[PDB]
Structure formats: structure tokens, C-alpha cells
């Protein structure tokens, strides 16, 4: 440990990467282990590519692409000291950021570096993709959030959302809200279409390590061993501001929706299971899924993502998604 967890887009597979280098890919529902690597190395994060067949692991200095059975396919010599990984499913681009302060977009299909951008703000502390428009949000040690596209050498937007390093960034499915946490014990909910700050929970009991937003819109926050959830937090109304306790049962104040305490563990990362009422939590001793009623999207669309997807539907879906890959330069605000 500690263990970083990343579920597949359709929620059928779980990818786990321990810090000391234990990487495993498994179908958690049927308990089948697709691959298990015991790399004697420091692994920071891993992500699935277009589907469960391939996944990427950010090791000590280089990122490696692996096969379904765990066979190494490529060593990405260009990506150096990557600490965060993200995959744009519609563009087939793999994104990395780390201690070099360099944002690199890599096309998995053709295997050519689409673009490498210099952030100029030192090491990158957080990363989150805007699923609506595929714009990457990076937090830095100066406390700003920068929006990036592969086709612009300079950031599209710069947002000052903290007085210290931004620990984590979360963006909702609709790409309308953003939630950022900083080392200054503050959580800020943003309106990224109009770039207006909505809420600012100025003082938290301890700095919030991670934030995640579900399909339904639940806001998840982790503070060391604690995991706290809020419902309807992402709204323009002032009453929707998160609070930890209602003062004398005031109806307007928005108390936590759910809470859970991992007694002796520091939470590593949070991931909502895509189409289930579950929240995955990676921690020092392993992984735990918390039952969160109302967390996930009840109604999925089979054309885009299908949890009951067969191999024949998979290899057909792989080609048509590859035929209509969106060009990288299409990415705009």
C-alpha cells in the first residue's frame, strides 16, 4: 500500500496500483484476475485505455502500456516522472503530468505525441478532465487552476481557487461545476462555464486530500481517514453551501448526506463506480467499496457504454470508436 484505484468507463473492471508496485487488473463482479504485476518499483497511478484490454502504469520515471494479460507493450520514454494519468475516450489521447510541470498528450491509436505543453508553474498537484469538452484542469503549488487544450501552447483559462497548493480537482459529468480543494483547508465550488465562484467552505477540520463528483451529482470529500458526502451541493443557491452541522436544525443549511470513517487508514483516492450506487475508496491496507444510495446513473445507454458488453460487441465497438476518433485540435472550451 497505499492503493490507487481506477474503474473502467463502463464499471466492469477495476485497476489497482499499490505504491510499492503491486498492479492488478480484475473483473470485480465475477472475481476474475485479468492481470497482476509485481513490479519492484514505485507506482503512482494507473488508468485504463479505450477498454479493459490495455492499461497504463506511471512507474518511477516512465509510463508503461500493458496488455490484458499483463504483457508490456510500450515504454513511453517521452513521458518523464508522470504522477497523474487520464484518458480521453473519444479522442484516444493519454494525458500525463508530474514533477516536470509538462502536460503531454499521447495518441494511443497511432502512438505519436500529439503535443507537449509547458505549464511553467512547477510540479502539478492535481488533474481532472472535463468530460463535456475534454479540457484538462491542472492545479499548481501557487494555488491556481489552469485549463488546457492540446492545440494551444498557453492555458485557455487561469483560476485562482486557493491560497496554497490545490490538492485535488473534480468536475461533474455535465461539465458545468468544478470542486477544488487546497492545502489551506478550503473547498471551493466553481461554475466553469461562466467562471464564477459559487461556494467557499473556508475552514475544514483538516485539509481535504481528494474530491469526486458522481453522475447523480453527489460531492465526495476525503480528509485523511474521513469520507464525507453532500447532495445538491453543486447549485447556485446559497442554501446549497456544504456545512458539517445544522445549527439548531436550520432547514436551509446543507448537512452531510453520508459519512464514513476508516479508523486507522489515510484515504489515497476516491472513485465512484460508474453505473452502481457505490463509491470506491483506496487506502493504505487495500480497497473498500461504500454503498452510497443514489450515487450512480441508473439509466445508461448501451450505444456509448454497456456494462453487459460481450467480447464480440467489444471488438466491434473498438473499431467504430476508432473510425470516428475526434481530432485532437478539435478540443476547445
Amino acid at each position: 500500500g497505499p492503493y490507487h484505484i481506477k474503474y473502467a468507463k463502463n464499471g466492469t473492471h477495476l485497476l489497482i496500483t499499490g505504491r510499492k508496485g503491486h498492479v492488478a487488473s480484475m473483473d470485480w463482479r465475477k472475481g476474475q484476475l485479468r492481470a497482476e504485476l509485481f513490479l519492484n518499483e514505485t507506482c503512482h497511478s494507473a488508468t485504463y485505455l479505450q477498454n479493459e484490454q490495455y492499461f497504463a502504469v506511471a512507474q518511477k520515471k516512465y509510463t508503461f502500456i500493458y496488455d490484458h494479460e499483463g504483457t508490456e507493450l510500450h515504454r513511453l520514454k517521452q513521458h518523464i516522472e508522470a504522477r497523474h494519468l487520464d484518458f480521453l475516450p473519444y479522442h484516444y489521447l493519454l494525458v500525463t503530468a508530474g514533477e516536470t510541470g509538462w502536460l503531454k498528450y499521447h495518441d494511443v491509436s497511432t502512438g505519436q505525441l500529439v503535443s507537449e505543453l509547458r505549464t511553467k508553474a512547477g510540479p502539478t498537484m492535481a488533474m481532472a478532465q472535463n468530460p463535456w469538452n475534454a479540457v484538462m484542469h491542472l492545479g499548481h503549488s501557487n494555488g491556481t487552476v489552469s485549463l488546457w487544450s492540446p492545440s494551444m501552447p498557453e492555458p485557455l483559462v487561469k483560476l485562482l481557487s486557493a491560497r496554497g497548493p490545490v490538492n485535488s480537482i473534480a468536475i461533474d459529468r455535465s461539465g458545468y461545476y468544478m470542486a477544488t480543494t487546497g492545502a489551506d483547508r478550503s473547498m471551493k465550488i466553481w461554475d466553469i462555464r461562466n467562471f464564477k465562484q459559487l461556494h467557499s467552505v473556508e475552514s475544514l477540520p483538516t485539509p481535504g486530500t481528494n474530491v469526486s463528483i458522481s453522475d447523480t451529482g453527489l460531492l465526495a470529500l476525503s480528509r485523511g481517514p474521513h469520507v464525507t458526502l453532500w447532495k445538491d451541493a453543486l447549485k447556485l443557491s446559497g442554501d446549497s453551501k456544504p456545512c458539517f452541522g445544522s445549527m439548531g436544525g436550520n432547514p436551509h443549511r446543507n448537512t452531510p448526506y453520508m459519512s464514513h470513517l476508516f479508523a486507522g487508514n489515510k484515504v489515497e483516492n476516491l472513485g465512484f463506480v460508474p453505473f452502481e450506487d457505490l463509491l470506491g475508496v483506496g487506502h493504505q491496507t487495500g480497497i473498500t467499496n461504500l454503498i452510497v444510495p443514489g450515487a450512480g446513473e441508473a439509466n445508461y445507454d448501451a450505444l456509448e457504454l454497456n456494462p453487459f458488453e460481450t467480447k464480440k460487441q467489444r471488438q466491434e465497438q473498438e473499431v467504430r470508436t476508432l473510425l470516428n476518433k475526434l481530432p485532437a485540435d478539435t478540443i476547445t472550451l
Binding site: 473519444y90 468530460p131 463535456w132 469538452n133 475534454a134 459529468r173 455535465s174 461539465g175 453505473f275 452502481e276 450506487d277 454503498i291 444510495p293 443514489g294 450512480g296 446513473e297 441508473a298 439509466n299 445508461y300 445507454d301 448501451a302 450505444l303 456509448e304 454497456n306 453487459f308 460481450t310 460487441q313 473510425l323 470516428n324 476518433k325 475526434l326 481530432p327 478539435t330
Partner: protein, 49 residues
């Protein structure tokens, strides 16, 4: 208290008969189908090619 969670009937999604096709649920949510303009442009470009 009142607890309810997303609950999938496997028979509604995985047919019992081996000869039956699999059900394909459809949700026309825009949030589930991003890049409507970009995707159609590429399909237009592929059709032209």
C-alpha cells in the same frame, strides 16, 4: 430508514435464451453523449472519404 439502490435484473439485460439478442437500453441524455458537433463532423468527413 428508507433505503433504495440501483437494482438490475440480469434477465432483463442478459437474455435467458441463447438465440435471443441482448437488450439495448437507450437514454437520450445529452450528458451521456458529449461532442455532438465534433462527432457528426468526423462522420461527415469519413463519409466524404
Amino acid at each position: 430508514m428508507k433505503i433504495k439502490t440501483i437494482k438490475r435484473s440480469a434477465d432483463d439485460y442478459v437474455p435467458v435464451k441463447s438465440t435471443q439478442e441482448s437488450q439495448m437500453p437507450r437514454n437520450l441524455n445529452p450528458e451521456l453523449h458529449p461532442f455532438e458537433r465534433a462527432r457528426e463532423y468526423t462522420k461527415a468527413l469519413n463519409a466524404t472519404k
